[PDB]
Amino acid sequence: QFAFVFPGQGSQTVGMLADMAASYPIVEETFAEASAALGYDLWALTQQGPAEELNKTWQTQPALLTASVALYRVWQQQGGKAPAMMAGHSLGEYSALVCAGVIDFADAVRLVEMRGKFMQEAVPEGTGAMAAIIGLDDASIAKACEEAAEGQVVSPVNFNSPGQVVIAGHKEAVERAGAACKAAGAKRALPLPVSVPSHCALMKPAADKLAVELAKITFNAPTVPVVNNVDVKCETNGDAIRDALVRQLYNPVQWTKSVEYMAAQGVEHLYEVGPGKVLTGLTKRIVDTLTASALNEPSAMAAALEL
């Protein structure tokens, strides 16, 4: 019936979960647990920022992971039933995996911080770019991307829904490519304010590195199925999960097919377990019978729990 789905970069705000925190002590206990693993106050980070800082990826990832795990902990605390299916967008997949009980929360926390770092350090800032292409079909974008590439690297990285695709690579090629896409009938190429071209070829070297760290973290069997970004496959072999984390890094995030798979899968509703409404917003664009809501405020937490 329902799945939990988990956001990643983009969903951060300074202030996030404040309200939940006031009604649920475990939100802060939770940030405390992670703060003690990062060696700084992560709650204070999210609450006070600044943004500039909270938006740097090696802190964002840990903050979002933490929000999500916190909100999940609330669900269970209140005798929330376990979802049938989870998915997590980009960094989201890590949260999924924690709540599915595959990676322990504190390993995850250090993990996604290291990830951040490998990521940031694989491309020098102002080197790369991401853009959101509103309103073209997938293949005209591939094509756009291919002709704009001109020796550099650009390609679609986020298949978010039909008529929303993110692309990324060398700043210039992104430029060429957005233009192309506009040529080709797109409503919008809207430039995205991110350093890091996640999920294209340029993250390869980060991911090599990420494999090494992963290889030290124990990966247990999922208690719930987790549809992964990279294959839209529900792996159980931790070694296979690990392998998919690694390729997530340099391969497109298949969100659209993933939400589809879970409709195809039985699921009638999707709760966004983390700050923001982004996965919520996309859902009906993918399957408009499907319904979506965020579990990141208390009325809504309460409201969902009553069913």
Ligand SMILES: CC(C)(COP(=O)(O)OP(=O)(O)OC[C@H]1O[C@@H](n2cnc3c(N)ncnc32)[C@@H](O)[C@H]1OP(=O)(O)O)[C@@H](O)C(=O)NCCC(=O)NCCS
């Ligand atoms: C970019 C963003 C914020 C857009 O979501 P929303 O703002 O909720 O979209 P809305 O503004 O509600 O949708 C309407 C507008 O978007 C456009 N649009 C959005 N999805 C569309 C789709 N699938 N097909 C065609 N047009 C679409 C238009 O419909 C436009 O209408 P108007 O010109 O009349 O405003 C969201 O998709 C997002 O956060 N994406 C980031 C995903 C990602 O890669 N994150 C990593 C870090 S950036």
